[PDB]
Every structure is written in structure tokens, then in C-alpha cells.
Amino acid sequence: EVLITGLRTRAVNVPLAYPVHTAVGTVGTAPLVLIDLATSAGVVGHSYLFAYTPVALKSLKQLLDDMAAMIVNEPLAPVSLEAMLAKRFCLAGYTGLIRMAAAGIDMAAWDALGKVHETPLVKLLGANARPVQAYDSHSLDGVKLATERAVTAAELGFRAVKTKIGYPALDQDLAVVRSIRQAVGDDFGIMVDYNQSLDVPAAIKRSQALQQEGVTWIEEPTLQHDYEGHQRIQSKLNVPVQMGENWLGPEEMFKALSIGACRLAMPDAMKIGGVTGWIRASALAQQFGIPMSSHLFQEISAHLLAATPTAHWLERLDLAGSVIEPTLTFEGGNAVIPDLPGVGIIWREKEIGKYLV
Amino acid sequence: EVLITGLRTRAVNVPLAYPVHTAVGTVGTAPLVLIDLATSAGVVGHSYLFAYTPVALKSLKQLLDDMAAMIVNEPLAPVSLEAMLAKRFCLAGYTGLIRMAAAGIDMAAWDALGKVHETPLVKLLGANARPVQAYDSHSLDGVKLATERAVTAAELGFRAVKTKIGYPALDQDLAVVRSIRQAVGDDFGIMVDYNQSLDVPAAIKRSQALQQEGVTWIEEPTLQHDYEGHQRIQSKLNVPVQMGENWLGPEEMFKALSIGACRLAMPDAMKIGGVTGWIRASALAQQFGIPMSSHLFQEISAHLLAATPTAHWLERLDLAGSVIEPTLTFEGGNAVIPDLPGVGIIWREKEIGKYLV
Amino acid sequence: EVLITGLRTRAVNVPLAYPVHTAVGTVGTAPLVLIDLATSAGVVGHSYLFAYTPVALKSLKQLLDDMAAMIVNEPLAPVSLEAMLAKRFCLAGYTGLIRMAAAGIDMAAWDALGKVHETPLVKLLGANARPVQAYDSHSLDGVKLATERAVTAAELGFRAVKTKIGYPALDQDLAVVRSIRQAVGDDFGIMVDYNQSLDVPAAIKRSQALQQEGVTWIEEPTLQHDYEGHQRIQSKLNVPVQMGENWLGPEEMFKALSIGACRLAMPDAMKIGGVTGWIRASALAQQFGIPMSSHLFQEISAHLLAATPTAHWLERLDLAGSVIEPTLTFEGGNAVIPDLPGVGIIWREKEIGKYLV
Amino acid sequence: EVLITGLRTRAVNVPLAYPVHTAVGTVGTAPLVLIDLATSAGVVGHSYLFAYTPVALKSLKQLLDDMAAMIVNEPLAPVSLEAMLAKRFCLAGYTGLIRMAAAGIDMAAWDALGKVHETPLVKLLGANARPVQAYDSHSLDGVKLATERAVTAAELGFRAVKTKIGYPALDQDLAVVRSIRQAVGDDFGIMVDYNQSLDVPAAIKRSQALQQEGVTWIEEPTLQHDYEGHQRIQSKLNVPVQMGENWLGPEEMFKALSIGACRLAMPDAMKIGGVTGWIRASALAQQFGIPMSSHLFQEISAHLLAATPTAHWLERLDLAGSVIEPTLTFEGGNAVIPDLPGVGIIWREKEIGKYLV
Ligand SMILES: O=C(O)C(O)(C(F)(F)F)C(F)(F)F
Ligand SMILES: O=C(O)C(O)(C(F)(F)F)C(F)(F)F
Ligand SMILES: O=C(O)C(O)(C(F)(F)F)C(F)(F)F
Ligand SMILES: O=C(O)C(O)(C(F)(F)F)C(F)(F)F
Ligand SMILES: [Mg+2]
Ligand SMILES: [Mg+2]
Ligand SMILES: [Mg+2]
Ligand SMILES: [Mg+2]
């Protein structure tokens, strides 16, 4: 009944006020692929992909362009489209950039399906919109900038902030975390993210020191794929280990949770397999008793978290704000889904032209 | 926007063409609760429950009637409704009859949501309709009647049948299976169901004998809650052990799959928690690598299996045919979803009056 | 030789001085089903069921009324009656309300058997009566009322009290527990009950804080069915995790203990399967080295704990005191079994009429 | 001392004598990226990548081209280069196409290092050249063509062949294997490949049937990422389950071997991470006691298997024969490494122009 009739992609390198410094490199500009999925119903699904590094940006766009051939003239049925793509890429490897591209399609197909039915995505998934608590996500900022950004976040009504750590010395990690605590006060969350930067023994040592400071969670202390190493680190901690932004599909989540890698999860809407993958991930987090937060993609994650039985936090890190209208709002630090069909992404068409690659 | 405005239930004891004989007793007629869920949009959601024994029938209706005040004025958002009911019944025990009642509400709410959007439930879930292979489900019929029924099913185009076994002697089980096999030939499925009738050593001995006959699966060989015992039985078999019709919620499925109880699953749309529970169950079966079939509820199960990654068989056992229009049809032994909004259940209002308890 | 000759049920909604506030809802009045089991010996067995919420009250009564057909004219042999009911409800699901109703029958049958033999139940079970230490069980009361109730309990001779926690902030849980400690002094038990209200990481954080206060146990920190989550919480604690009030049958206890969910158990005489189920549960707690307390049902639990090899505490929470004579007494905070045949329940017939539903 | 000075890639779609038919689709021609790595020493390293589907071909080339700036001016030290690339792609996800691109760089860098030292790669790795038994790799060819191809291979001196199976019926798998066996005799290897086409119960049933026929190994019976499912299949078999062609890096191999997924391994030189990844994989297979074969990449795999402690078979499947000189030869079914520095890859420059995408 409704068919996909076109796929348009636009590669952009977009401005961020504050470059995302990490222990393993700076993300100084956001390389995104913006996706428009045309349909026989006239509505156009919107989504985007994050390419992490501009090195991958043109490759990701080209891959999606070539993938168009597989989906045009197929029905707008995201679950069936996903199964078809999983089969088509069985031999190549349905992971990494291929999986990310499949997820971009999925996110745009669900946005379009929401638009077909003139209903916000959360409602199409069978849930009510609810406000979801959000933390403001910062970077490897040093004491001066971490303090400045934390005061700003608290003024904006956020109740938690995340900072990136993994400086050369533990004492530097501690100094930044302690300075943020002075800026925000005691009844306020401080999440920390190591971005895979430590080995297991260093992570045990650093994390036990951070736990004495009362941090909210310790995210990706070691190499993302090392689920057994994360379990060994978690075994030495009361604070929860958080991970999941790098799980490519719910199958990788399942493997990590099966061995007790972490006590918190935070899938990325792109890497986990879009809406279809997120819903499957939510069913796993529920059974394994794991509170589930989001990673990036704040626009769609506000909808998805509202349908997630163990919903925890929304990450506010506004990578696409320069090119997407601010229809997602924050009240008392909680993300509020807009009353728009599908996801609520409206492009800033005049702005996009400035950033095209 | 769309609110629930009322709930009506009707308790019936309905005729079946053949009484369902099992090793642990006979289900001679079908005790059902038929559910109507009124909404502020003018559409009415329909579902029903199976009470198994008339002894539970009036209790189940009374419970639903007393739950009306919990759901009236709530939004028609089945995922959010399910979370609310789980919380309200946290103390009483969200299992057994209470969980079955919540599932009947869920199935009616999803039917209504499909009607609000003028779309079949399968499409609302994001999948394409597809025909699903069905097996014709029979009973503890003895050699003559089992064989007759199998021939009739083969003539109607079914490619498998299920018979119930657990006669006093193993030789009687084998005589039935052999007689069916002679009548239907080697290219035909024969599933067998023990209906929890054997202890573990008996199940190992009977199952290894049936395996030498060539059966398709061996269903519920022992007490349904004994997941470890099912695992011990499965450990002695090449043929797959099938179970799941008695799982109350996806949490019970998760416990059974976690310990290797079975190599096939067949959740019951009511006991698993309606559409909401089924979708969660489907995520679990995908990750555990378990082909997933249905139990009863053929009308909604045709939709649900179309959205299930590891969909296997639909059970054809038409409990409600006396009171529901035959909009679900079978072509070449495959169930075909009707082109109707929601589930496609239409009451036979003239017939329901005959069977009221 | 002795046959069951009648079953009478009465649904009542009975007054409690102090409504049972919990983190997940208030139990403001006690919905009970009162059971009279007539016999061919003339004696009448007495028991009752707790329905938790008035939503379930009429359904539970109706279920028991319909179950009467299965037990009238059967011998007064509770172990054989239980096996018969387990078989009769094999297909429907011998759990939830069905199991609770079966347990009400069992508790009344044993009371009647005690009366046939003119002997208190504890003696029929082969044990001597002994006083059993009891704690006074309170609710989510806030600082003022928790202090008031704790002073009263200490004046009455109880040596321990339980309070319900799970306020929005950990600091609120701590304030109440600390205030109770000022009211009762240092050589006095303070149990705490979270009523399933936390996720696993929150339970680890809160429980480690409470353990620094010296609480006696931490009860049901997370969803009752999540035995693996309880084990993960227990793994992070020196204080024992307590659970079991929600186990429906000894089979659910077995599953929880097999995976190390808890270091203490507290079966509910109704949910565990009555006297027959309690005795089986006691044999399991003995082998798994788990001290075993009771949940509610103080009248019969005084007998059952006296026959329990690992008996620990009796919960004093007098749900049925408005309708049962106070033949159970307390001396120095220990429950003292009355010298009456069977359980010692004598109805307050004049009072029951005030509360009938 | 020796630096990388440039990178050139060429994307081709090349003819194969026989299209590779599999149960999950056909690879009709070979999409390849041919890589030239220039150095300050004047030598040029050569390698290539297989893109599986033309849909990934332009994306893979674009990614390599964009990676040029990362590796130009870096020393020609493949182990250090690999560590650098792992770190640079830590966030994007060092797997899938990105990891394949890094492996193509690695293979070209090692070829160049062999040329810098005027020595075949096998000798640079510290091993002697030795002939390695090879099997001739065929496809889902049907009875007539499978049997013809097997006879031709036997005539050329190969002592084993691999056929792809997973026809719609098990009897069709068996008919193919039996026909080959009749034509080649009892002293000959017949490997079979299911190309991920079966669910676990289907794989158990089909595999136990093939085992009774006498096959050499059963390759990828189910979804490649499902290591637990492969273990369940292997647990039901005497014949070895073979897998590994889809492991992206030795970390995936380590996960699969840790849970007993298979009794044989066959890493793909590209997906495992080039020479650097292969050498790591070889260390793992030695410790886990797993005989290790190759997948594709016959030119470099002849060198690598000569340095592999548990070397088993080389797969002869000549994907690049249209564009690479036939310096690798076969004598008595054994691959013979050419006496040339590095890998021995020489481009057919006149032929490459025909096939450019
Ligand atoms: O079957 C295999 O091994 C293949 O990788 C395929 F692509 F078909 F999956 C190949 F290339 F060798 F044919
Ligand atoms: O908390 C408990 O134990 C209860 O059963 C409850 F219902 F509240 F859960 C009660 F009420 F009896 F105290
Ligand atoms: O056998 C089964 O599946 C049944 O649930 C039974 F009730 F008999 F247990 C039914 F209804 F399908 F017949
Ligand atoms: O840290 C993260 O989550 C990121 O994905 C990164 F790329 F940095 F890894 C970012 F940038 F978006 F913040
Ligand atoms: Mg992060
Ligand atoms: Mg059955
Ligand atoms: Mg309690
Ligand atoms: Mg292969």
C-alpha cells in the first residue's frame, strides 16, 4: 500500500560550539549524513547518521546511495525492510558501516510511517509521550571549561552532566570531577566517560577512586568489544559500569549482557539498528534488569525512551542542532517530545547549504 | 487524544467440532471471555481470553469487570497501559489469571489502535502481511480418529498435523504416530504433544522412541514449570523439545531459554502478555536462536507471526470459530491475514447469545 | 473416613488502624476471603485469603466458590487434595489466584484435621509449640508516624520492627530508618522493605547506604520475579536480602534459591501453597541453609514456624484482627500459640457483618 | 627509514569461471578493490579486498582513499600501523568495512616489507615455504554440475572439494553429496558449506544426516554471529563444525573459540585483519587446539598457512585470477608459494582496464 519511492542523502560537516575532546582524539566537527526517504504517500521520512570522523563520511554516503537500489519500490514496512537488508548483507557482514546505513533507512522509514498515520512516533509504538530526564553531555574539557559548562547546564535546568575523562594522570581526572561538583552542588548527577581509554587494571584503579567521589556511572572504561574486561572491571565496583553506544545490533548487546559486562546500558539509535533494533534492545534490557539510556540522536531517542520499559536517561548532545529545527524542548531538564508526526525532525534547509561536503 | 471509554465482557462456553482430549484430561467445550474495548474515537477493540476450564470462567470475567475502572479514561496506548497494570498488580502477583486479564485488555487495545489508524495490526507493527504455514491441531483421538483427521487435514492442504499423546503405554503412542505416517506419507509434519504428562525418565524413554519414528517435535513432555527437567529431557534428544504455551509473560520465557529448556518455543498470545508481550518474546527468541510458533489465538497470531524474526508455525485450533467470523482463511495450508483494520475479529452476535454462561 | 461436606466463602473489606502505605501504592483496607470448610466429622476448618487489592476480591471469591465442586465429598486429606488440584489446574496454570485459592482450601483442611484430632496444628505436624520471636510490621509512614509506631511496638515488648521504604530520595529512606533507631535504641531490630520499588543499580546504592545503618535485612529490593537481579544485589551486600512473600508454590522458591537470590526467606502461607506448601518450603530452606520467616497470616504462621527447622521471625501484621478473636498472644515480643485445636481461629461473627462485600 | 609515500586503489568487478551460487544468494562476478602502497624505498606493496557485493564496492574504495592521509609519511611498520588505525577508528567502530580497509593496508604493507628485504613473506615471518594441501571450492551447483566439477578437480590432483548446500530439501543436499562421492570415491574429502542458511534445529537435523554420508566438515550451518548456536549444533555432532570466514578481527575468533562454537577454524585474511591479524589468530587456534584453514585470498594464504602451527587446508577459490598473474601454482593438489619477494602478486595491467567500475 505505501511504497518507498526515493532516497536522498546529503553529507554535511556541521558546527559544534564545543568540540568533543576525548581521551582518544577530538571530534572537532560533526560529520553527518542527512537522509530523506520519499514515499508513495507523499510524506518524506527524515533521519541522519553520524560518521564519527570525516574519514568515513563520503564512504558512508556512497554506501547509502548504493543501498537505495535495494529499498526503492519496497513497502514502507520497516521490520520487513530490516529483515531483507540483514539477508542481503549476510555474506558481506551486517555490521559496521553497512549496519549503520541500514539503521539510517530504518529511522527514516519509521518517521515516514508516523507521518502516514499523522501521529508522533512514540504513539505509533503504542506508548504515551512522557518527559524524560536528560543530562548535558560535555567533553575532555579541563577544569576551567568543565566548570563553565557545568554552571551553564545547571542554569538551563539539567540535573546531571557528563564529562569525558582519561587524562594522563588519575589526579587530573579527579580534579575535573571535583571541580564540576563545586559548580553543581551535591544533589546533581556527574557521569563520567573514559571513551575506551584504559586497560582493565587501570580502569579498576581509576574507577575505585572515582567511586569515592560519588559519580553516577563509569562509561566505556576499556575497549568497547571487550565485554569480559568490562565484566572484570564491574566486578570490582559498586558504581555501575555503563556501555552500549558501540553495540552494532541487539545481538552485540545480548552477548555483552549474557556475560555481565555492565549494570547500565546506553544503545545508540543508529548502531543498535534504528527503531527496529532499539525496540529489540529494550526487550533485552528489560529481561536482564538493565536501566537503559540513549547515546546521541536526541530527537528520536526522546520517543524511543518513552516506549522503553527500563528507560533511564536521555543524552543531550546536540550534534545536529545546526541543521534541525529545535522542536525538542527541555523543561526542568526533561526532554519533551514535540506534537509533530513521526520523529519531529524539520530540516533547516537554508543552513544545510553552508555545511555540505 | 484517543481515550478508553469503557469495557464490556461476555463469558461463553462454546462448542468445538472435536473435544480436545489430552493425557491429563479433556477440554470438551471452550470457555471464553469476549472483550469489547470502547474508545473516544468511536472504534471498538475486540479480543478474547481462553479460561481452560469453566471453573475459572466467571472469576476471569469478574476480574476484568473490576479492572474497568483502572483503564477507563486512560489513553489508548497499550505499552503504557501494560506498564500501569504491571505496577497496579505488583503486590497481588502479576501472573496467572490477573496477567491473562491484562493480556486480554492489551489485545483489544492493539485491535482498537489498528482501527484508529485504519490499518491491519501487522502493518501497524511495521511488517508486511505474509502467509504463514499452519499445522492442524488435533487431540488424544485414538488410532482411527487420529488417522482420519490427519487425512482430512492433508486434503485441505495442511502440510503438518499435531496429535496429543501420553496413552497409558508407549506402544499406544507409537501406534497412533505410525498410523498417521502411513496415511500422510513421509513428506508431512507430525508434531506430538504430551501435555505435561510424563516424569523426566519416562519422557526420555518415550521421546527417544518417538524420535526413531520421525516426529517433528515433542511438546511439553513434563510439568510446564520444570524448565530444568525440560533441559534434561532435551539433552537426551536430537528431535527438538517444544514448549512455551504456559509461559506467563516474557520473563518466564527468559528463564526457560536461559537454562536451555527447549530448542523451539510457542508462546500463547494471551499468557505471554498480548501483543506487547509477544513482541518482547519475539526479541528474546531471535537472540536465543529459537524458532517461534504460536499457541491458540489463531486470529491475532497470524498478524504477530508476520512480525516475528524467527516465525515458525501457526497452530490452527479454532476455539472461537462459533463466535468469530471466519475472516482468517487458509490457502495451501498457510494462514492468510484478512484485509481488515486491527486483528480482523468480527463477532457473530446472533451466535453469542446461545452460549452465554 | 472424614469427608469435606461444604465450602462457604465470605468476602470482606476490613479495617486497619494504619493503612499499609508502600513505595508502589497504598493498601488502605484489607480485602479478605474468609473460608469455612464443613466436614462429615462436624468440625469446620477455618482459613482466609488476602486479595491485596479490592480489584481482585470478588474474582477470588468466585474462583473459590467454583472450586468447591472439585473438593466436596473428597476425603479430608490435604496432601491428596493438593495433588488433585495441581492436576486439575495443570492446563490453566496452577499459579496466581488459582494457587492462592487452592492454598485457602489447604489451610482450612489442615485446621479441620487438627479439629478432627482435637490437637493444635503444630502438634499434628509432629512439633511442640514454642514461642517464636515476632516483629511489628509498619508501613511507608514518614518520620513522625514511624517514630510513634516504633515507640508503641517497643512498649508492647516487640524487639524488632519493619518499616517500608522507597521514598523518592535515598536521604528520605535514611531519615526514617535513623529516626526509628532513636525511638527503639541500639539492641533492637529494624527490618526494611522496598516492595519491589528499585532497579538493580538503585538497590545496590540504597542498600549499601542502609547497611551502614545496621538494618536487619533488606526485603524485595527489586521486581519479585527477578531472582537473578536479587542475586546481583545480594552479591554487593553483607546485610542479607530477604524475599519470598511472592513465591507461588515451593517450585518458585526452589528456582530462587538455586541461583542464590537471597540469604533469608519469608514465604507467605497462602502463596507458598498453605500448610502443605509451607512444609515443603521448610525442607528446601533447611537444605539451602536459609533462615525462614513468615509473611502475614500470623495465626497459622505461629504453628508453622514452630515446625520449621530454620525458623527465624514471625511477621506481626494483623490484617484479620477485626474479624478473628485474639487467641494468639504475645509475651516478651514472642508469638504464643493458643491451646486450641487446629489453628485457633474463632470468627468474630458479629463483626464480620459490618465488612461484608 | 622506510616510509609510506602513497596509496592508490582501483575498484573492479571481475569475471569468475563459475558464479558462486549459495543458499542465501549468488556472487555472479567478484567486486574487488586493488591496492597499491608506494614507499620511499621504491618498492610498491600490492594487496586486494573482496567487497562481496557490488553495493559495497564504491564505499570501500572511497574509505581507503580517505584513509590515505592517515598513512602517508608513516613508517612501513605494519604492526605499528595497525595499532594506529585501531586507535583512529576506536569511536567509529573498528569492524566491518573499516576493519576490512585496514586489513588491505596491512596486507599491502607486509608485501612491501617483503620487497624491501627481497624475501618471500613466509620467510620474513620466520618460516620455511612448504606446499599446503588445497581443496577446490565450488558452489550450489546442482547434482550434474557439482559432480562434473568434482571429477575435474580430482583429475587436476586435488584431494578434496567443497560444495555449497542448503537446497530447499535435505534430500537435495544428500543427492549432491552422494553423487560426488560416487564419482570421486571413498578416499577423497568432501567439505560442505551451508552459508548461514539454517536455524539451529534445522542445522542439527541436516547435519546429522550429512554426517551419516561421511562429509569432511560442515561449514557455517547458522547465522555467523551466533556463536552459541554454532556450539549447540556442534554439541550434537561427531563431524566438525567449521567457521571463521566472517570473524572481523582475532577478537571475534577469541569469543567464538571461548564458548566452543566449532572444532575447526578458517579465518579470512582480509576480515581477520591481514597478516598482523592472521598471526594473532594462529596463536589463538594453536592454544585452543583448532586446526586452522584459510578463506579466499589464496595468494597470501599460502604464505600464512606455512607459518601457522595448526595449518589445515588452503581454500582454492580464485577470485582475482583475472587480474593477478598465476604465480601461485598447484602440484598434486598442494599450493606452492612462488619464489618472489613479498606475496608474489603481480597485476595483469592490460586486464584491469576491462573491469574498472
Ligand atoms: O561462500 C563464500 O565463502 C564466499 O565468501 C561468498 F561470498 F559466497 F559468501 C565466496 F566469496 F567465497 F564465494
Ligand atoms: O507489604 C506487604 O507485605 C503487603 O503484602 C503488601 F500488600 F503491602 F504488599 C501488606 F500490605 F500486607 F503489607
Ligand atoms: O492442549 C492445548 O494446547 C490446550 O491449551 C489445552 F487446553 F488442551 F491444554 C488447548 F486448548 F489447545 F486444547
Ligand atoms: O563520546 C561520544 O559518545 C561520541 O560518540 C564520540 F564520538 F566522541 F565518541 C561523541 F563525539 F559524539 F561525543
Ligand atoms: Mg560515550
Ligand atoms: Mg500443547
Ligand atoms: Mg514485604
Ligand atoms: Mg564459506
mmCIF file of N, CA and C and ligand atoms in Angstrom, chain A residues 162 164 193 195 219-220 245, ligand 5:
data_model
loop_
_atom_site.group_PDB
_atom_site.id
_atom_site.type_symbol
_atom_site.label_atom_id
_atom_site.label_comp_id
_atom_site.label_asym_id
_atom_site.label_seq_id
_atom_site.Cartn_x
_atom_site.Cartn_y
_atom_site.Cartn_z
ATOM 1 N N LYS A 162 27.552 15.096 32.002
ATOM 2 C CA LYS A 162 28.597 14.071 31.786
ATOM 3 C C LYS A 162 29.844 14.751 31.277
ATOM 4 N N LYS A 164 34.043 13.918 29.932
ATOM 5 C CA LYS A 164 34.933 12.882 29.413
ATOM 6 C C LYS A 164 36.239 12.989 30.172
ATOM 7 N N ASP A 193 32.936 9.529 31.369
ATOM 8 C CA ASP A 193 33.120 8.690 30.203
ATOM 9 C C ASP A 193 34.597 8.595 29.897
ATOM 10 N N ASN A 195 35.791 6.725 27.308
ATOM 11 C CA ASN A 195 35.962 6.509 25.841
ATOM 12 C C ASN A 195 37.014 5.457 25.514
ATOM 13 N N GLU A 219 31.530 5.124 32.250
ATOM 14 C CA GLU A 219 31.196 4.666 30.904
ATOM 15 C C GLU A 219 32.424 4.276 30.088
ATOM 16 N N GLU A 220 32.282 3.147 29.375
ATOM 17 C CA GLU A 220 33.309 2.547 28.499
ATOM 18 C C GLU A 220 34.724 2.706 29.034
ATOM 19 N N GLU A 245 27.048 2.161 23.571
ATOM 20 C CA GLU A 245 26.956 3.077 22.417
ATOM 21 C C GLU A 245 27.611 2.477 21.195
HETATM 22 MG MG MG E 5 30.433 7.746 25.405
#
